């Protein structure tokens, strides 16, 4: 009945996206050829939310893959599950953006964007009732950031009444993977504040920490990091795909968690997470899950939630569970940590439960926190950007692509405004 359209932009976007797709396939019992080999009828009842049925009992992701370089696409197509994707849904350029937002948004991306829009339009028109769109990408590169942002805006123009969701991997505090990161991030943020309904802030640093400290992983891989993200994504849409006792879809969550339009940057979290050794020495109960959820070490954003206050928290539980227990525990946590919750929104917590747990587990939870501590991240980027602009460093790479200084200033202003707003509520 309801449908979700998936978009993947740039390297990071594609790589996370593939993992996500794999996860989804596993969940719904669909193999790398597109055929259903599941068992439970619940797996197939709402399969249309993510998959189109392409006849001969075969299923194909409602997924669009976009990049200015073909290498990533090639890598994906050759991967395990590369064959499930519709060949015509891979939309690639030849040039690349060279970690330049300008190229992604105004130049190379501009040339290619029309085609992707057309594909998206086609996808929408086949689906009976689109809930909306989920975009996976980074803010730090050129494609995912510049072209992805452009795509969002164009989508919104066509479909202003549909939900616009992003899973954005953002620049970490400790180490930078690009030199121009602050510029790319900032510009992306500028567009995102105005054009998306919610943004899940994923940080690679946080993921690494989780892998090291919680998962006890000596040598984490980018794949492993992506897996966590994928899991979170899956958790977020579970109520659309399976039955439950209390159900919350993308719109319900959004309305619960965004009290003012601009404040839609979430810190996602996932629970439980245990090592191979420490699997034995703990019981799989709701309390443990709750503990894991409300903990700085388990947050996928590089921000300490205890340095701000939670405006809203959405908790999504999977498995056969006592609702009473959940209700009590959510209450109890709030009572305990009253100082970390904004005082003018009584009952800061929204709860949803899906009866179907993920595979291999008895019970799972996904956490979405809207914390005023996210301001810290924004501040750090903002400062950096200001510093860079003070010396006009790297600016000719962007102005050379037709961009004007004024745009940069505007972006800065928006960024500062957002942080001010966050502070006010804090």
């Amino acid at each position: 009945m309801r449908e979700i359209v998936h978009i993947q932009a740039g390297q990071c976007g594609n790589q996370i996206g593939a993992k996500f797709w794999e996860v989804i396939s596993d969940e719904h019992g669909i193999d790398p050829t597109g055929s259903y080999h599941g068992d439970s009828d619940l797996q197939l009842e709402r399969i249309n939310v993510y998959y189109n049925e392409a006849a001969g009992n075969k299923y194909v992701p409602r997924a669009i893959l976009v990049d200015l370089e073909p290498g990533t696409m090639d890598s994906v197509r050759s991967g395990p599950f590369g064959q499930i994707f519709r060949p015509d849904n891979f939309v690639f350029g030849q040039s690349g953006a060279g970690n330049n937002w300008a190229k992604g948004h105004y130049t190379e991306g501009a040339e290619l964007v029309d085609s992707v829009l057309d594909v998206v339009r086609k996808e929408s028109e086949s689906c009976d009732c689109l809930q909306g769109f989920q975009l996976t990408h980074s803010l730090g590169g050129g494609t995912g950031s510049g072209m992805g942002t452009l795509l969002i805006s164009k989508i919104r123009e066509e479909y202003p009444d549909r939900i616009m969701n992003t899973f954005s991997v953002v620049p970490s505090p400790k180490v930078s993977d690009t030199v121009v990161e602050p510029y790319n991030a900032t510009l992306s943020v500028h567009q995102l504040v105005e054009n998306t309904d919610e943004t899940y802030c994923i940080d690679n640093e946080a993921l690494y920490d989780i892998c090291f400290r919680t998962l006890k992983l000596t040598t984490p891989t980018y794949g492993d990091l992506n897996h966590l993200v994928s899991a979170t994504m899956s958790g977020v849409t579970t109520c659309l795909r399976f039955p439950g006792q209390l159900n919350a879809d993308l719109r319900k969550l959004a309305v619960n968690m965004v009290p003012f339009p601009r404040l839609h940057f979430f810190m996602p979290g996932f629970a439980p997470l245990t090592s191979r050794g420490s699997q034995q020495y703990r019981a799989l109960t709701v309390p443990e899950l709750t503990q894991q959820m409300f903990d700085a070490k388990n947050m996928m954003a590089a921000c300490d939630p205890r340095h701000g206050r939670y405006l809203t928290v959405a908790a999504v539980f999977r498995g056969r569970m006592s609702m009473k227990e959940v209700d009590e525990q959510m209450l109890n946590v709030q009572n305990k940590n009253s100082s970390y919750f904004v005082e003018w929104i009584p009952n800061n917590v929204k709860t949803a439960v899906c009866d179907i747990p993920p595979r291999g587990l008895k019970m799972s939870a996904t956490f979405i926190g809207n914390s005023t501590a996210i301001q810290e991240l924004f501040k750090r980027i903002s400062e950096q950007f200001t510093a860079m602009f003070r010396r006009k460093a790297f600016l000719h790479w962007y102005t050379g692509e037709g961009m004007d200084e004024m745009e940069f200033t505007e972006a800065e202003s928006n960024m500062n405004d957002l942080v001010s707003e966050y502070q006010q509520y804090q």
Partner: protein, 428 residues
């Protein structure tokens, strides 16, 4: 899909190309006959059935060096028309290269380049290998650079340059040539990767335990760096960086386009066995001045942009940790206008090693491209050298003979003074 054209100019360029191409062949399993019993396609075109041809042009103004290529082991590897030779050399004279001798062969080489480009579906750009000091490497290269910009323009151009050493040097007129080529090429090049023969010698002696390094050894070492730079295009990796990236991430102002290369680990089979060559350890090696490939003092300068290209059995987290550690270290200083100074590439393929080479087989390597105010010092000495000789008008007549004017020298001087000023000012 996306392709890269290599240009090898003059003796130094040609010899480096010989190494590089050999390495490429070894890496992709291409025999010296062009046969192999699909990413290599970025560097090799395919003709008919079971033959592969380098996307390369070799140019020299005299026949002798290229004649060795056309009679040697890899005679069948290259297409005859892409090995271009004149009759008379540029005789260590920029003017002969740029005007008198160069203007006779440039059109031909351009046509070849155009033809090469016609076979490309997604041309990334050009890699040009040449010396600063030779008449062809300087004069011809500047001519060619300028021409390229007109014909193509927007496509990225990358230079690999044998920068002259402070003490050690072969030519007498080398400073003149270096200044002049710098002046003329500045506005036409996007990024130029300097290396220094002295530094490579020292590294060979100190780190590889080689008593008597030959030019071949140096060339081989250079080849590794080139492979590291282009591995992101020739293989599939975890997190990867194309040729179009570098110019954006390493050049903060248009004229300040001289990043320097460093490779690690460079060690023999003796010292390889008795060492756990971890990611942190290799990374650390790169930021110590004795291992770097240009003779110069980074301790006396500041880093502006640093790009680290890892290869082989390497995982992101440890790299990140290493970078953090480097950042923490007070003796490695970055300019205050650049809080994010790192660009990181990670590729799955370990460095392949040439049979009978000096280097041991390693699980991991790193190639750092670093941009530093320490280059100013290097520029300064060169300038000083120029100044002395011009004070007496020593050798100036030769240049004039070949159509150059004295005013050009003055202009070149002025431009270099400007460059050094710019370098100084960025620092503060």
């Amino acid at each position: 899909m996306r392709e890269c054209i290599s240009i090898h100019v003059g003796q130094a360029g040609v010899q480096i190309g010989n190494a590089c191409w050999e390495l490429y062949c070894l890496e992709h399993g291409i025999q010296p006959d062009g046969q192999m019993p699909d990413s290599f396609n970025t560097f090799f075109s395919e003709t008919g059935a079971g033959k592969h041809v380098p996307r390369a042009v070799f140019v020299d103004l005299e026949p002798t060096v290229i004649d060795e290529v056309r009679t040697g082991t890899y005679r069948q590897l290259f297409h005859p028309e892409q090995l271009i030779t004149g009759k008379e050399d540029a005789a260590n004279n920029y003017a002969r290269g740029h005007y008198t001798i160069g203007k006779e062969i440039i059109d031909l080489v351009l046509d070849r380049i155009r033809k090469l480009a016609d076979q490309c579906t997604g041309l990334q750009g050009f890699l040009v290998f040449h010396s600063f000091g030779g008449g062809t490497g300087s004069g011809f290269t500047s001519l060619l650079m300028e021409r390229l910009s007109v014909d193509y323009g927007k496509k990225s151009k990358l230079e690999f340059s044998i920068y002259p050493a402070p003490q050690v040097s072969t030519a007498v007129v080398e400073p003149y040539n270096s200044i002049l080529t710098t002046h003329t090429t500045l506005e036409h090049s996007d990024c130029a990767f300097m290396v220094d023969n002295e530094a490579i010698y020292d590294i060979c002696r100190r780190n590889l335990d080689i008593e008597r390094p030959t030019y071949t050894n140096l060339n081989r070492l250079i080849s590794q760096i080139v492979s590291s730079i282009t591995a992101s295009l020739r293989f599939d990796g975890a997190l990867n960086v194309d040729l179009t990236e570098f110019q954006t991430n390493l050049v903060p102002y248009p004229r300040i386009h001289f990043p320097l290369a460093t490779y690690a680990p460079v060690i023999s089979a003796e010292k390889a066995y008795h060492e756990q060559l971890s990611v942190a350890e290799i990374t650390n090696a790169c930021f110590e001045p004795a291992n770097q490939m240009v003779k110069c003092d980074p301790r006396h300068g500041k880093y502006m942009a640093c790009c680290l290209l890892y290869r082989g059995d390497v995982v992101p987290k440890d790299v990140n940790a290493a970078i953090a550690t480097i950042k923490t270290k007070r003796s490695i200083q970055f300019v205050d206008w650049c809080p994010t100074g790192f660009k990181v590439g990670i590729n799955y393929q370990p460095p392949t090693v040439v049979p009978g080479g000096d280097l041991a087989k390693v699980q991991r390597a790193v190639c750092m491209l670093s941009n530093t105010t320490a280059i100013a010092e290097a520029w300064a000495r060169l300038d000083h050298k120029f100044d002395l000789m011009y004070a007496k008008r020593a050798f100036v007549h030769w240049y004039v003979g070949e159509g150059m004017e004295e005013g050009e020298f003055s202009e070149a001087r002025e431009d270099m003074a400007a460059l050094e000023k710019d370098y100084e000012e960025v620092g503060v």
